[PDB]
Design a protein around this ligand. Structure first.
Ligand SMILES: Nc1ncnc2c1ncn2[C@@H]1O[C@H](CSCC[C@H](N)C(=O)O)[C@@H](O)[C@H]1O
Ligand code: SF4
Ligand code: SF4
Lengths: 9, 316
């Protein structure tokens, strides 16, 4: 978690 | 958007977190077939522009034999891999040693572990501690801890009980997106509100990241919110990554979103008095909460069509 577009990664 | 790709391996999980955006559980049955996933991974490994392949779920370490097989398919192509896990496998230090040895040998550049009050009923704190401590032997694997929180469950005691195992580990606490189990199992007043329908200048999507999801669809990002939208990039069963990238770059809705921000869509709903009709909430924990409310039905997406057609005619 940092930017929302990679939230579940 | 063609240097990274993600695959959601399964909705099955050993945990049943009350916030889970996928309502994952041991009895979840949504997933792409194993042979189909092997073909996707082989294609992504062979692809010349993809640099990173990320795996998520569900719990990807649940069927470790399959995860290791996929990482071995990628190995000759030297792509970087990222993994995210609830760390249930941390219970045994011998298992932790085996998995870190494999991750190191298979170009895993990042491992994210999720632990908080929602995951705590399913995974013991000692399991998380074993993973975090062993990670010190592998400084080339970027290790992080994700903590999903609500006002009533801020994970303060969780972090204290991890003790010195969290030293040197990047920790991020984040609020909930109201999707999946979070919609029905968490009181909406316990979800933090950081944005409102008024701060339209800060309503911008951070970017796209292609995800081949466990429902067999393809999504433009890996936010929990997107998976309940009807924004998909899949047009056929055997679709190449070149085609997925081309579709993402030519999607008019996503182009307008990138260029104009959420205010473009919100102003149309406001001018047409559709905010209540489309159940757009007034406050949100994240910009993705605005995204999910605008596009979580075919009716909502199709409502914008004549406006997007007019935008295309005036600007293209
Ligand atoms: N509704 C929701 N809102 C915000 N974060 C959520 C969410 N549902 C799941 N997450 C977070 O999304 C991340 C990936 S969930 C899948 C990977 C793994 N089972 C895990 O738990 O890490 C986790 O950090 C999880 O806490
Ligand atoms: S948040 Fe992760 S560990 Fe919890 S139920 Fe969902 S997929 Fe499983
Ligand atoms: S704003 Fe929408 S498209 Fe952008 S990361 Fe969030 S859910 Fe995905």
């Amino acid at each position: 978690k940092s930017k929302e577009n990679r939230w579940i990664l | 958007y063609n240097k990274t790709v993600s695959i959601n391996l399964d909705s099955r999980c050993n945990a049943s977190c009350d916030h889970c955006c996928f309502s994952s559980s041991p009895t979840s049955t949504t997933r792409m077939e194993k042979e189909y996933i092997r073909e996707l991974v082989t294609e992504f490994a062979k692809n010349k522009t993809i640099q990173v392949i990320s795996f998520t779920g569900g719990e990807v370490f649940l069927d470790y034999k399959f995860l290791k097989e996929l990482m071995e398919i990628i190995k000759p192509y030297e792509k970087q891999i990222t993994l995210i896990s609830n760390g249930f496998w941390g219970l045994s230090k011998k298992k932790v040693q085996e998995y870190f040895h494999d991750m190191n040998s298979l170009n895993v550049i990042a491992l994210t572990i999720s632990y908080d009050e929602y995951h705590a009923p399913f995974v013991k704190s000692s399991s998380i501690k074993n993973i975090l401590e062993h990670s010190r032997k592998y400084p080339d694997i970027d290790i992080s801890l994700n903590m999903a929180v609500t006002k009533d469950k801020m994970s303060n005691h969780i972090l204290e009980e991890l003790g010195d195992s969290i030293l040197g580990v990047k920790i991020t606490k984040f609020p909930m997106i109201s999707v999946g189990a979070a919609k029905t199992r968490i009181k909406q007043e316990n979800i933090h509100k950081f944005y409102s329908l008024e701060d339209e200048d800060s309503l911008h999507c951070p970017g796209y990241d292609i995800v081949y999801h466990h429902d067999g669809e393809i999504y433009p990002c890996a936010s929990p919110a997107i998976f309940e939208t009807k924004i998909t990039l899949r047009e056929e069963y055997n679709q190449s990554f070149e085609r997925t990238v081309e579709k993402l770059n030519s999607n008019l809705l996503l182009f307008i979103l990138r260029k104009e921000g959420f205010k473009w869509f919100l102003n149309i709903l406001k001018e047409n008095n559709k905010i209540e009709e489309f159940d757009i909430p007034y406050e949100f924990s994240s910009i993705c909460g605005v995204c999910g409310s605008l596009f979580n039905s075919a009716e909502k997406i199709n409502y914008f069509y004549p406006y997007m057609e007019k935008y295309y005619n005036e600007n293209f």
